[PDB]
Every structure is written in C-alpha cells, then in structure tokens.
Amino acid sequence: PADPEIVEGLPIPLAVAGHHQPAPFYLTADMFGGLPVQLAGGELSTLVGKPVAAPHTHPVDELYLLVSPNKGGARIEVQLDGRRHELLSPAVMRIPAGSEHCFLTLEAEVGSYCFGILLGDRL
C-alpha cells in the first residue's frame, strides 16, 4: 500500500560537511530510480541569527532559492569565497561548484524557505 510515486518520509537528514547536525534533504539522488539533481533546505523562521554551517563546498553547481509569503519577508547573507552577498526574497543565487559558501538568516517570517538545488547527483 506504499505508493512508489510518492515519498512521505521527509525530510531525509544527511550528514554534510561543515554542518553540526544533518542537513534536511527533500530530493536525493537515489529517488525514483535515480535523480539528476538533489534538493535540501527548509523553513527559516527559527534560524534567524543561527547559522547551520561553516563554509563548505559541493562538486556540482547549486542554486539557492529564497521565498517567503510577503515580498521582502526573508533576507539571508551568503558568503561565497569570503565575499559577502545578500538576498531579499524572492531571490535566486548561483553557487559555483567548489566555491566555499554558507548562509546566515538575517530576517525571516513564518513561511520563509531557502532551498539549495544541487545540479548533479554527488555531494
């Protein structure tokens, strides 16, 4: 009675470099016979001033997606190779493969989310 086209055992918490608890995945490479992308992230309202990770890298390009119910309802700082960037929702930022990076939530309302879309099947 589990439906093979629906996954409900989410998020999938994976150990990731630079983190101090597992990172929450919603798409993993082993889903549905093999996916070409992975997707991690979560809701930001309890993360204001609380970084999930030190600077870390992936071997594939990644895209950050920042959304919130109200325009401007979430703001994150993203460090990229030591250069500070800032995103106000809605926003998309490219994180080049091998770039040392991390994010810090500066502002978030209920329903603010950041997701990282990893353009490949490897971490």
Instruction: Quote the least distance from Cβ 66 to Zn ion, whole Å.
Output: 13
Distances in Å between the alpha carbon of 15 and those of 40, 53, 86? Answer: 12, 11, 26
Residue listed under structure tokens 């250069």: 83
- The angle formed by the CA atoms of residues 121, 15 and 90, to the nearest 5 degrees, is 65
31 binds, among a copy of itself, Zn ion, none (CB under 5 to 8 A by kind): a copy of itself
**Contact predicate 91/103, CB 8 Å:** no
* Residues making contact with Zn ion (CB under 5 A): 3, 23, 52, 62, 116
Residues making contact with a copy of itself (CB under 8 A): 3, 5-8, 10-11, 26-27, 31-32, 35-37, 39, 43, 45, 61, 63, 65, 67, 69, 80, 85, 87-88, 90-94, 110-113, 117, 119
